[PDB]
Amino acid sequence: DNFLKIERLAENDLPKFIQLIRLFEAVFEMKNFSIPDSEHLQKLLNQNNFYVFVALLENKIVGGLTSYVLEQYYSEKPLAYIYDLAVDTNWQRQGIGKKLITATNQFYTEKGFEEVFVQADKVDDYALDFYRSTKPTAEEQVVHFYYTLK
Amino acid sequence: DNFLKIERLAENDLPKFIQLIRLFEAVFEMKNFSIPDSEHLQKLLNQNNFYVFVALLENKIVGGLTSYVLEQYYSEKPLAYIYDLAVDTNWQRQGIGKKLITATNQFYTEKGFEEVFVQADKVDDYALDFYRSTKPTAEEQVVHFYYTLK
């Protein structure tokens, strides 16, 4: 419970960023992962269009999410794109994911954004059930195409 | 079309950008739309994580797409997100969409990107048939959630 802290990472928070990436690595079961150098990660963290939120128990990162800002041409109110969200396997199903989403939308609300969106694979039943429990405004069925470049 | 030119907009291409946005308004049939101030749109075009491609016959923009750069923490090579794509309704089905997609992926390959991705609504049959003809590496069923902020 309230021991749980949500923190938006700042530029002097590289070690917490790396901690979160390691969390992503374990929860998503990424194989043979080679983390990019700290120079590259620091520059990413320093971008004005990128926001990381972590969940903390004392100094344990037990969950987190990453998000990108997409400036619009349809409107001056930006969009936020939640890219990854994960909670440590030993801490899932305890309200952390929800608190992360809540804090994230609250932050972009204060910033006057129009909308925050997030995606899940249609086959990921548990992810779909989670996002549906966060009372989103709406959900849409879509097809994601990608081009692996040479 | 051997008079068709494909062009990547630079910082001094605001008039073409505005022209593409009006094309988007018409083709997407947006109602009661107000285009943002030019100073807003000019700053967006100035961003180095935002790239616009347009299709031209003489001075006339007949199509185009917008794309966002998403820097990764999984790799040093960025992702590109194709956000909008449209061709003037009088000029559809003549290869313009393909050339746009081709030029876009060629650009991002030259920049050392890992991947380009794009999304179409499940009900958008014509959009889906188009993307499925552009030889995408893969396609995934995805559910898209959004939070409309106050």
Ligand SMILES: CC(C)(COP(=O)(O)OP(=O)(O)OC[C@H]1O[C@@H](n2cnc3c(N)ncnc32)[C@H](O)[C@@H]1OP(=O)(O)O)[C@@H](O)C(=O)NCCC(=O)NCCSC(=O)CC(=O)O
């Ligand atoms: C999805 C999570 C972040 C969700 O956060 P939490 O686990 O903290 O859940 P939390 O309690 O806030 O949210 C509570 C509720 O989740 C769903 N709930 C309850 N039990 C569940 C269960 N057994 N399985 C799945 N969902 C369950 C319910 O709606 C319950 O709500 P109630 O009780 O009210 O009904 C986490 O489970 C996780 O890290 N999963 C790993 C995969 C993942 O995160 N995938 C998303 C895409 S990121 C990505 O990019 C992955 C990839 O593709 O590689």
Ligand SMILES: CC(C)(COP(=O)(O)OP(=O)(O)OC[C@H]1O[C@@H](n2cnc3c(N)ncnc32)[C@H](O)[C@@H]1OP(=O)(O)O)[C@@H](O)C(=O)NCCC(=O)NCCS
């Ligand atoms: C979808 C759109 C961008 C496609 O561009 P376009 O220039 O019309 O498509 P192209 O001419 O480059 O297509 C090459 C081909 O792709 C697939 N294709 C494209 N349009 C198709 C269609 N309307 N029906 C079936 N297949 C189609 C085909 O193989 C067509 O090839 P062929 O004509 O040689 O068989 C354009 O029709 C459009 O602006 N539509 C409305 C807006 C929209 O849906 N935007 C995308 C939203 S995700």
Ligand SMILES: [Mg+2]
């Ligand atoms: Mg801090």
Ligand SMILES: [Mg+2]
């Ligand atoms: Mg009117």
Ligand SMILES: [Mg+2]
């Ligand atoms: Mg303004």
Ligand SMILES: [Mg+2]
């Ligand atoms: Mg610039």
Ligand SMILES: [Mg+2]
């Ligand atoms: Mg064909």
